[PDB]
Design an enzyme around this catalytic site. Structure first.
Site, PDB file in Angstrom:
ATOM      1  N   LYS A 112       0.872  -1.169   0.000  1.00 63.92           N
ATOM      2  CA  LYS A 112       0.000   0.000   0.000  1.00 63.92           C
ATOM      3  C   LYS A 112       0.912   1.224   0.000  1.00 63.92           C
ATOM      4  O   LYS A 112       1.887   1.268   0.751  1.00 63.92           O
ATOM      5  CB  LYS A 112      -0.910   0.010   1.228  1.00 63.92           C
ATOM      6  CG  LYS A 112      -1.979   1.090   1.203  1.00 63.92           C
ATOM      7  CD  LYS A 112      -3.124   0.718   0.268  1.00 63.92           C
ATOM      8  CE  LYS A 112      -3.744   1.950  -0.354  1.00 63.92           C
ATOM      9  NZ  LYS A 112      -4.855   1.599  -1.280  1.00 63.92           N
TER      10      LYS A 112
ATOM     11  N   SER B  71      -1.023  -0.929  -4.446  1.00 62.07           N
ATOM     12  CA  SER B  71      -2.258  -0.148  -4.381  1.00 62.07           C
ATOM     13  C   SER B  71      -1.988   1.198  -3.713  1.00 62.07           C
ATOM     14  O   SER B  71      -1.518   1.246  -2.583  1.00 62.07           O
ATOM     15  CB  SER B  71      -3.329  -0.925  -3.608  1.00 62.07           C
ATOM     16  OG  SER B  71      -4.481  -0.126  -3.372  1.00 62.07           O
TER      17      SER B  71
END
Ligand SMILES: [Mg+2]
Ligand SMILES: [Mg+2]
Ligand SMILES: [Mg+2]
Ligand SMILES: [Mg+2]
Lengths: 364, 364, 364, 364
Positions: free
Chosen positions: C163, C233
């Site tokens: 992330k 992401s």
């Protein structure tokens, strides 16, 4: 029912931001236990799948829950949270925090001053949204909020904010499982039905519309039925109606006043100026006396604005309420000097068709 | 009613692109005067304010108008133009051109071959959209198209494409001016009502649903009413219904066949594979025998797909038909090997609820 | 570094829903203190202004914070939260909860079993996003996560989830205030730069790409540089990188295994089937052995899919990652039978250009 | 270079609507052969995949082509078509038709009157968009248009409209195939680069910016470089730049005048009012003297408007130019009384950063 009301407009850097509220508490400008309502503008889409509204409420409730040693869900029964999503164009995300204390003993100010009261309805069954039960339960709550506010007559009521639910596929299916068709099967359209029924509930309580005319079929059909005081916002984050009644009272000692008006259409900045002027704000340098502006906006349902076609109701990419907020936010910002104002879309039975009510809270 | 049908799938680099059609004409593969229908996928949003559909039609009609020395508007009465907007995910914009000639005087084996027929309804009043008049006028047109196709029985009918209108604010206002409320005031929702009524019209003509059940209130309410052959697409670009009936005939000499099936839901690639297999196409290297696939897709109205919640009907940024096209386009592409296929969203009364009919045209 | 890993896929009815997690805790299936990571799919837009990711994290952290008597922000330093927004098409919002305990003394299973480790980087300056510092700090974290997992060699590493942050106007302005141009001034584009640099950091740590080639200019330019294990992401909810390394170990006693593969493009369901088959899942009735699938998807940057033009990179209404998730979600759902799978968009330097890595966790 | 200029603002009911233009021709108000430019607002998204711009041009060109017995593509070399997509909020779709005749041989008073001239650049290679070649070719065209207009000095130039291209994945791929990286790989961002380089070209021609500062790296980076006269609009429908120079001349006999100004930001209605006032229009009943307003708007790149955060550059659902058009359209409408005005988004190097130039054409 004699109060001192404080009102604070605080910027948000994101939906979960409570730093501004903490600052008010930490600097002693507000006591957590005195907070009775928060009206927010959050930067989600303001439509069905906007969870910025719920998130903002969750973080505010958690913040106050810590100070009050209460679970967040208890704080939500104590404080009226109204989160209006959608901050298009120049609209700047923020909260307006309302605090209530007993009136100051040192009697008394030179005229009426700001007062506020809150109320809640029961949860609605999906099949009740947009219909009689929502209208009548809302009307009851409005009267309760007015009483809670110590508002003596309708003449002293200036703004009625309502937060209301919407339909999802799960709720539509639940309704059908009991043999009751919901008011619509379109989730976006359900928001308008909820706002509209809620607004008519306000009109009923205020006697602006007679009870005889408020049949289910009139919702979203009869444009001539409206409240000039109503501001309704639908959301996925609740199953009941939340009501905030704002007005003026002789018994209030607040260093604030409120006035209201109606925008005849989405670009009617003139009406907003006139109301601001009525509060003695008559130059650009006096605009800083305004604590906030709260306004309803909508896409004119006849498909035109001052004789010219608009595309807000035929745009499948950008929903009509998003367009309407962008427009009225800009119109108001052009007057007051910035976009940190409460502008809420979808003004079904709220002011004129294509227009909406608004109110201005200013220093006394 | 003895024909030779040619079918050409041609890529489009943009909605107004007629270069591919010109190439077919210039290389003698098709005669302009023989073209009877064009089914297109255009890269607008496929919803209310999609003018890529009208633009594509205008440029095709202008192209053929030059060759036939006809005004474009005359070409549109001669040729059935069905432009389906929305090419989400891997969907690749293209036209499928259908040409019809007298049956060729030569030997062909036993076995039925591809035939096609077209029909048009009258223009609909706004208040007729989604209602009885649309149902019954469509049913009439479907029977006319079947006759035009030389389709002997319902068993030999494999696909009924219908293009249908939608509501705009102007049309809603016009309806109200005559004291007839339209079926809905939401322009997006009106597309579903139009598709649904049109599809029920197809079901009526094909005897899949008895006439007794086709009351106005059944439209978008009674999921158990449907046609397994119906493919309906709504658009802003027309006020009438356009019908293309596709099937099989002993009297046809086309070097093509058609088969149809139904997807039980938006990810039912298995059903598509089964139908392709039934045409003798088994391996991946035999997929090039498929001229095109034509399929209906929709967001499951119960809000779930195979027991799991979906967000397609609660998404205010991306409308449900856009999601559904993306999904089924991908599912089909995963079978046939690319996204240059006709996938159309909104399958109200078309196949099962949450599913849709599809057909495959392949080399004989 | 000998562990027992438990993995639970739990449905979410909305981004803030922790009812499923509470149920796992209340029924004794997981101990709050053992939870080491949560990978979620949340129903916001998955792009810049998606606050569903932060909201989900806040509610999970608050939930676990209550059980552990920790403040939520402390829980986020203890547990790796990776919330991937965007659940288009049939994608069903959910969390995958990962719990880690000491290996069972009863030695030992018949082959390698699932292991997992986590790591965090420092916060990045805006001007470091998409650049060397992000690449190298990520590489460090990946190696730390592998060590934490007890993964002996690269051959036993099957999935690296990261992330990462993105740029906002405020961050762009901050960068410029120090005389450092950020990697881009477009907030949406910044997400791709962040994902790409992070993925190259993974490729560096795993030695799939030599360090010599990882100059700033190669980010988003050199398609031939990639990691076949990387899943990145981007999100507004954090300023650092969060790393989860998933693999296999002889020392692990988990009743689970993992396998990975690469989708050559967004509709390559065949590759997903092949990997599932390799885990001994060879009929539709054996699919229930899969705990979850985790996959990267993207719009092919050459503008075509298997030779046919796509519109995903030219669509100004719907961003490319939204299209890509819809497509790959549908492709995978068509194999495993539903859309409750982890599909994340934007696969810059992750697998082939136009494709992406994926992994499958299944019962041993 | 002695002209009579006529200017007509005509409503459009849809992008392909030429009924208004036909009416002007049929009633003898304009001769087809005299039309030199059309500036339109079309109701597509105004971004990359807006084909309403091309469609409008195609239908206008076809309309005039019939009257002039010319092919449409020839009409486009004769007439400067500038179609600006995006009609958000109250913006009402329309065309402004400009016709040019020899100066009328009759008395007119002292005082300059409206004049207009047009020019075209060559087609640009993808790799030239946003860069030196676009800057310099534009500068050349601007000087040519000024000469064509008979504009004696820069002081008599009031508005320079430019239509410019954008990048698609195909064009990006073509650029890379020649070893020249394009200015960006994001198609939406490419529109800003095109507008910006074009605007700097205008600044070069008008001597507002010295040539020394116009290096490629300055495009979209150096906010202090701008033209106060420039209005640039990018589109997919052309590969070259189209230039319209509008100004005032002693030798013109037009019954019209033009004035220009600059909006300091998107809500600077005050500046618009001041310019209108300078044309002798003071009261609301004198607003009907305005033929049209042409204005540039943009999302403030510092992320704030008058000190308050805005969301226009962090919104992944609605692009910044859509927000900006909605806002400035509303601000201007609140002054002039309706939204049938030309408002174009993306004002890179056009007026101040966050602001834009505008002009008003009014009856003399
Ligand atoms: Mg109203
Ligand atoms: Mg169906
Ligand atoms: Mg990749
Ligand atoms: Mg500017």
């Amino acid at each position: 029912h004699m109060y001192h009301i404080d009102v604070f407009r605080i910027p948000c850097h994101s939906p979960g931001d409570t730093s501004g509220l903490e600052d008010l508490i930490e600097t002693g400008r507000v006591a957590p236990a005195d907070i009775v309502a928060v009206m927010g503008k959050t930067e989600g889409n303001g439509c069905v799948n906007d969870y910025t509204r719920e998130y903002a409420t969750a973080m505010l409730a958690a913040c106050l829950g810590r100070h009050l040693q209460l679970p967040p869900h208890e704080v939500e029964k104590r404080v009226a949270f109204v989160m209006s999503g959608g901050t298009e164009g120049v609209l700047s995300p923020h909260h307006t925090v309302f605090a209530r204390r007993p009136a100051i003993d040192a009697h008394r100010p030179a005229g009426k001053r700001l007062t506020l009261g809150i109320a809640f309805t029961r949860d609605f069954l999906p099949e009740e949204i947009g219909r009689h039960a929502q209208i009548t339960e809302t009307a009851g709550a409005v009267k309760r909020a007015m009483r809670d506010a110590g508002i003596a007559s309708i003449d002293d009521l200036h703004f009625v904010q309502v937060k209301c639910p919407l339909l999802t596929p799960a709720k539509i299916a639940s309704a059908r499982s009991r043999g009751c068709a919901p008011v619509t099967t379109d989730t976006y359209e359900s928001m308008g039905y909820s706002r509209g029924a809620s607004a008519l509930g306000i009109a009923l309580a205020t006697e602006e519309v007679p009870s005889s005319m408020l049949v289910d079929e009139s919702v979203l059909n009869d444009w001539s039925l409206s409240s000039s005081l109503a501001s309704a916002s639908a959301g996925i984050e609740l199953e009941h109606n939340v009501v905030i009644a704002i007005g003026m009272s002789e018994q209030a000692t607040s260093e604030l006043v409120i006035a209201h008006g109606v925008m005849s259409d989405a670009i009617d900045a003139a009406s907003v100026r006139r109301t601001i002027e009525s509060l003695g704000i008559r130059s650009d340098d006096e605009m800083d006396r305004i604590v906030n502006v709260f306004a309803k906006a909508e896409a004119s349902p006849d498909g035109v604005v001052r004789g010219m076609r608009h595309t807000m109701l035929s745009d499948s990419d950008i929903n009509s309420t998003r367009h309407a907020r962008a427009v009225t936010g800009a119109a108001i910002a052009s007057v007051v000097g910035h976009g940190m104002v409460y502008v809420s879309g979808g003004a079904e039975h709220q002011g004129p068709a294509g227009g909406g009510p608004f109110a201005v809270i200013a220093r006394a």
